[PDB]
Amino acid sequence: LDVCAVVPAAGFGPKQYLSIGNQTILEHSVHALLAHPRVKRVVIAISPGDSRFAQLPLANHPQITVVDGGDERADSVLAGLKAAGDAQWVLVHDAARPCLHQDDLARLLALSETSRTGGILAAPVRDTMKRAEPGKNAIAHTVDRNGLWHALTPQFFPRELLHDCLTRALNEGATITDEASALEYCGFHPQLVEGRADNIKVTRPEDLALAEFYLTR
Amino acid sequence: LDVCAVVPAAPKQYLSIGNQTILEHSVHALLAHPRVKRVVIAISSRFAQLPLANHPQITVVDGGDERADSVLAGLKAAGDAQWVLVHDAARPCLHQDDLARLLALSETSRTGGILAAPVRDTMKRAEPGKNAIAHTVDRNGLWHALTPQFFPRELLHDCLTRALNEGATITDEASALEYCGFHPQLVEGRADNIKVTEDLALAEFYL
Numbered sequence: 070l071d072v073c074a075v076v077p078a079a080g081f082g083p084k085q086y087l088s089i090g091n092q093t094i095l096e097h098s099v100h101a102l103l104a105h106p107r108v109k110r111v112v113i114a115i116s117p118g119d120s121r122f123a124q125l126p127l128a129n130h131p132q133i134t135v136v137d138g139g140d141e142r143a144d145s146v147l148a149g150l151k152a153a154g155d156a157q158w159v160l161v162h163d164a165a166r167p168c169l170h171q172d173d174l175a176r177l178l179a180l181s182e183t184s185r186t187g188g189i190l191a192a193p194v195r196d197t198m199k200r201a202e203p204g205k206n207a208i209a210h211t212v213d214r215n216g217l218w219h220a221l222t223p224q225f226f227p228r229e230l231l232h233d234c235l236t237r238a239l240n241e242g243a244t245i246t247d248e249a250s251a252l253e254y255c256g257f258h259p260q261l262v263e264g265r266a267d268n269i270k271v272t273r274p275e276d277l278a279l280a281e282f283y284l285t286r
Numbered sequence: 287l288d289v290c291a292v293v294p295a296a297p298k299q300y301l302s303i304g305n306q307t308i309l310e311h312s313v314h315a316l317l318a319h320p321r322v323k324r325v326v327i328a329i330s331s332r333f334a335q336l337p338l339a340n341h342p343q344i345t346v347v348d349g350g351d352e353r354a355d356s357v358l359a360g361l362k363a364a365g366d367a368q369w370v371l372v373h374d375a376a377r378p379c380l381h382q383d384d385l386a387r388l389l390a391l392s393e394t395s396r397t398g399g400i401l402a403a404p405v406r407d408t409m410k411r412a413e414p415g416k417n418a419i420a421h422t423v424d425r426n427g428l429w430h431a432l433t434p435q436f437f438p439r440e441l442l443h444d445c446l447t448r449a450l451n452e453g454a455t456i457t458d459e460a461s462a463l464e465y466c467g468f469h470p471q472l473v474e475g476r477a478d479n480i481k482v483t484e485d486l487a488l489a490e491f492y493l
Contacts, residue, residue, distance in 0.1 A: 188418075191410060196481070197457055199402060199472065201427040207469040208400075209427075211461050216412040217423060246408040250422050258418045261410065272406055275476070282491045 072178060073156035074102045074111045074223065075149030077142045078164040082116030084271045085164040089281050094271055096127045097167030097284065102160065102223070103132060104171040107178055112152045113164075114138030114145040143235045143245060150232050158187070159231055161248045162223040165271040168283045169223070173264035177225050180260060187226030188260025189249050190268060191218040218261055221268050224248040226259070288323050289389065290367035291316045291434070292360030296330035296349015298483045299375035303490045308482050310338060311378030311493065316434070317343055319385050322371060326363045328356035354446055354456045361443050369398070370442055372459045373434040376482045379492045380434070384475035388436050391471060398437030399471030400460050401479060402429040429472055432479045435459040437470070 078085055078095060085095040092100075099111050112134045115122050127133055134152050138145030146161055153159055158181045162169065173190050180188050198212040224247055231248060234255040238245050245251050249259045267283045269276065293316075299309035306314075309327075316322050327338065328349035338344050347363045349356040357372055364370055369392045373380070384401055391399050405428040413420040435458055442459060445466040449456055454465040463470050478492040 194409075197431045198405065199400075199429045199431050199460065201429060201472055202469060203427065206472045206474075207397075208460055208464060208472060209469065210464055211457065212423075212428065216414065216420075218410045218412060219407040220410050220422075221407070246422065249410065249419060250408065253419060253421060258413060258420065261412055261417045261419060263417075270406065275478070279478075282488070 070107050071109045071154070071156045072107045072158050072160055072181070073153035074108050074160040074162055075146055075153070076111060076113045076162055076164050077138060077145035077149070078113050078122070079116040079138050079145050081121045082118030083165065084277070086121055087271065087277055089167060089277065089284055093125060094167045094280070095164045096125060098162060098164055098169065099127060099133065101167065101169035101171070102162055102174070105174050105178055108160065109156070110134055110154060112136060112149040114149045143239055143251065146248065147232065147235055150228060153228060157228055158225060159228045160223040160225050163270055166222055166268055167271065168280055169268050170265055173268060174223065176264070177223060177262045180225055180262065184260055185227070186230065186252060186257045186259050187224070188262050189224040189247070190221040190264035191261040192221060192264060192266040192268075193218050219266070220247050220249055221264055222247070226252065287321050288367055289321045289369050289371050290364040291322050291325045291371040291373060292357055292364070293325060293327045293373055293375045294349065294353045294356035294360065295333070295375040296328050296356050300332050301482060301486055303378065303486065303493060307336060308378045308489070309375045310336065312373060312375055312380070313338060313344070315378070315380035315385070316371060316373055318382055319389065321389055324365070326360040327375070328360050352456070354450050354462065357459065358443065358446055358450075361439065364439060367439055369436060370439050371434045371436050374481055377433055377479055378482065378489055379478050379480060381476055384473075384479070385434065388434060388473045388475070391436055391473065395471055396438065397441065397463065397468050397470050398435070399473050400435040400458070401432040401475035402472045403432060403475060403477040403479075404429055430477070431458055431460065432475055433458070435470070437463065441468070
């Protein structure tokens with residue numbers, strides 16, 4: 070039942086080292102993964118040369134493992150998988166998603182009891198979206214929002230399947246984004262587990278206050 | 287340069303934050319810019335108890351069957367306004383710098399445009415009737431539509447009228463321009479410009 074999480078955290082050799090309260094965003098994100106007792110270990114893949122991570126209180130946690138990752142997210146995740154131990158299922162979570170709720174994580178982890186290809190947390194589109202004309206900030210058309218979802222993280226998959234698929238994706242020079250996109254590239258259709266929309270990613274300076282608001286709840 | 291705003295409003299907008307209803311917050315944000323001389327509110331009662339009814343810059347018109355009908359009624363009350371601003375009654379958080387940037391379109395555009403925020407998450411399309419991923423939807427060039435939506439008065443009136451007569455499926459004002467073959471500009475605005483419907487608490491934080 071053991072699960073190992075992998076947090077790709079390249080870039081310091083990203084806003085993961087920004088703080089909310091007394092912890093960095095990366096620490097909030099990792100403690101959110103450790104709330105579920107099935108998660109036995111969190112592997113953080115940092116860039117060669119990153120001396121920032123070693124400065125955190127989290128660097129001395131007994132369930133954290135730090136390895137160097139590579140150029141692209143897929144290389145980082147593959148580096149993290151080598152340290153997953155005996156886990157047969159792996160969660161991959163964004164270092165800058167510190168508002169992950171335990172309820173959502175538990176619902177996603179329930180997929181290993183039933184599915185073979187895994188799935189991701191996701192939030193249905195509730196607003197209206199527009200597609201811009203190529204290379205211009207003018208509207209081309211309205212995008213149908215029926216069945217349209219935001220992919221969130223974690224993304225939870227069988228370890229070997231994830232490994233094999235990310236390797237094929239890289240070896241064939243496929244353009245991928247999240248781990249689900251690699252599975253999709255390999256012909257699979259991961260489950261969409263609806264999660265809270267406040268599990269946001271901190272990518273711009275204003276996202277920090279919003280994340281804080283959500284954390285205080 | 288004069289602009290007339292239209293707020294199609296025929297309970298979310300009657301929820302309150304501080305001393306005011308969401309509708310009041312939304313109207314006051316529009317009235318904060320000097321070019322927006324008047325705000326026409328389409329109404330179908332709750333509105334009458336508010337102080338908006340007796341404000342010197344606020345006009346009331348009857349709301350219609352759908353948002354589109356309401357907007358056309360608001361255009362009938364727009365006077366000589368050459369450009370019109372249409373904004374949701376349930377969007378209380380609008381910053382003046384984003385409003386100013388949208389209003390600047392009148393100086394360079396013949397079509398108008400809308401406030402919008404880029405999509406940053408990877409997006410997925412589900413398999414029909416299943417909670418499984420069919421494929422990824424490219425997010426480059428993908429934007430969340432916001433309001434206000436700002437357009438030349440005649441183009442908006444003519445297009446909306448034609449779309450409605452032809453039975454087009456209209457969501458926002460931009461979608462009517464789209465139906466007619468026009469391409470409104472996307473002006474990036476802040477993402478705290480939320481539409482109330484939990485939203486209350488977040489809108490208050492932003493305010």
